[PDB]
Amino acid sequence: QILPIRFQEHLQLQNLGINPANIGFSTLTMESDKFICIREKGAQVVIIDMNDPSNPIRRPISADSAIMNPASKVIALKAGKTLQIFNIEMKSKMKAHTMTDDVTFWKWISLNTVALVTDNAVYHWSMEGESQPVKMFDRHSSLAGCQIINYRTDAKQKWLLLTGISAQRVVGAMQLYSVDRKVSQPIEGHAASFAQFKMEGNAEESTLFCFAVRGQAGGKLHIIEVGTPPTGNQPFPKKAVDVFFPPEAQNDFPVAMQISEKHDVVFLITKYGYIHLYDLETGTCIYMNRISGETIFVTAPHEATAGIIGVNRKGQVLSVCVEEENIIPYITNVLQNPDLALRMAVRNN
């Protein structure tokens, strides 16, 4: 019987000769579906080009972290407080900077900017020119002592979302910062994502903020609009739905979220390797399934299918996306929700 998603295993990194010891959160990064970057220690980095994963380049490094640019052959490296950005094409050092404070988390948040998180603050740093990191906001006390696990922004970079976790059950602490209001709010959540979404009859896109959590009430997914509706817009009615977990999955919680704006669906991944799909508009659950027996510990947008791609602890590179020929009939017949099916068919084709 037909499924509303297509799931694929693209490859297992060990088949490429990659050492399974090097396959985990701290030694393996994937900032986009274009590259996987692995630090292998007798130190070096293995850059896997996903268009051509057979011919990985290996370079010597002395960095404790390496994060490939989402799009181009540009790599950022750090060693303590020392940050450097390198052009692999032109083989040249682009930029360097020495932070006052240790950078405990960093990632590319677009094609040409790095977000830097310290104990203290969050910075954006352009890869271009000579510009220094620009402090975006001070960290809120409720992330104090958390493992920082992510950092998200909306498309305009007007809404910035820092996420940490701690063992206490694993509690999720987010800080949502408004760049125009210059104000932070604390949010209990485990995984989140922004999205653009234009309501029927509205002049302009809404900026949606979606976050999932497993807290005191159990599993919840929230979808809200951030900011004041544009002139010509109705506000987006807040949605709040449950995120189901098994009896076998008492210790599971959300670890990743990607949103397809092509189909307006939320992909959620759980620590135990379940995937869920939710309607972005209503939060209705479309699909759940265990797709991996290991934690998927890094995810990115999967650009070609507008899906989700990730890597699990055993080295499997997996993705999920909407199966566009099955999703409507699946919602009609299997979920028996013909109202949703017609709305999604019309909204997205």
Binding site: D52, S54, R59, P60, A63, K91
Partner: protein, 329 residues
């Protein structure tokens, strides 16, 4: 200086360049066949066939056609060579489906991969072995080493008139071996009988099944050691022996023509679960056999399956960054 292999047609009109002749199969994908042809359209084709027999049976397994002139990203090699060669240089790229059999020859039949570049109006036209060029490339199989327990086998014999056991256990140091790699065999005997083990014989045997046209099963030893190590009545014996399977023999599967320096014993056929074990043409596998040669009694042996693979291809700055031609022959 980077090597690049080249080959021209007889009339010196078309030359093909390739970075490599052997393309590694990494189970989820195969190295792409990334070439340049230095120039009617100009086409380049990749064919995989099983052949038996001169020839008396052939089955096509895969064909891919590229129009190379006139015109997924170019490899650094392609660009590098396009610039270093001219504007009469054009790229061609094949991706070989990973489920096709690897190159294999048994002496005769096999599976071969042929790259063919030619000049001609349509694809359906008279090819002249004069301004076309043909290259035999190989697909060779890699696989990574396996986590967890190694291979292990054991047997127990009771001889006529007795109920005392002769027990043999053996294991290998790995599940996955590469060409040229030694195999260590751990041998443990408990001899509670009144017979003596006179010697111990360890062999590596290849098994090759022909699955098309004229089916047949060959066996053939590729390493043999015997030791005059004896196991007395009521005594135990533990020893590690080392063997390496070596090409330096009819019925043997090779990855290559026996006449070429770079040919190896054939790699183990990786078989997907219910795959068509007929469009693979030849199925190759390997075992270690450990045999106790018993005095005044039948011998006692175990076998330990293993997999034989082609090996994988070989100041403040926090990172460090940094072309000769050869005949394909």
């Amino acid at each position: 200086g980077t090597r690049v292999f080249k080959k021209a047609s007889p009339n010196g009109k078309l030359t093909v360049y390739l970075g490599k002749r052997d393309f590694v199969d990494h189970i989820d994908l195969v190295e792409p066949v990334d070439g340049v042809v230095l120039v009617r359209r100009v086409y380049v084709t990749l064919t995989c066939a099983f052949r038996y027999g001169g020839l008396t049976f052939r089955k096509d397994l895969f064909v891919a056609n590229v129009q190379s002139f006139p015109p997924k990203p170019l490899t650094r090699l392609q660009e590098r060579l396009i610039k270093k060669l001219g504007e009469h240089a054009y790229p061609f790229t094949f991706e070989i489906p990973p489920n096709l059999p690897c190159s294999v020859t048994l002496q005769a039949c096999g599976v071969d991969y042929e790259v063919k570049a030619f000049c001609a109006e349509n694809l359906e036209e008279k090819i002249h072995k004069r301004n076309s060029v043909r290259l035999v490339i190989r697909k060779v199989q890699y696989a990574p080493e396996r986590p967890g327990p190694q291979p292990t086998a054991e047997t127990t014999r009771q001889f006529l008139m007795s109920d005392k056991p002769l027990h043999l256990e053996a294991s290998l140091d790995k599940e996955i071996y590469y060409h040229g790699e030694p195999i260590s065999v751990n041998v443990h005997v408990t001899n509670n009988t009144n017979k003596t083990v006179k010697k111990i014989k360890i062999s590596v045997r290849q098994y090759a099944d022909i699955c098309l046209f004229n089916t047949a099963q060959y066996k053939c030893p590729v390493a043999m050691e015997e030791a005059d190590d004896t196991v007395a009545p009521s005594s135990t014996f533990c020893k590690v022996y080392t063997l390496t399977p070596f090409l330096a023999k009819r019925g043997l599967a090779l990855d290559g023509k026996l006449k070429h320096e770079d040919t190896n014993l054939a790699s183990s056929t990786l078989l997907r679960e219910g795959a068509n074990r007929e469009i693979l043409g030849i199925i190759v596998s390997y075992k270690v056999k450990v045999k106790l040669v018993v005095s005044r009694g039948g011998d006692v042996a175990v076998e330990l399956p293993f997999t034989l693979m082609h090996p994988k291809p070989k100041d403040t700055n926090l990172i460090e960054l940094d072309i000769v031609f050869e005949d394909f022959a």
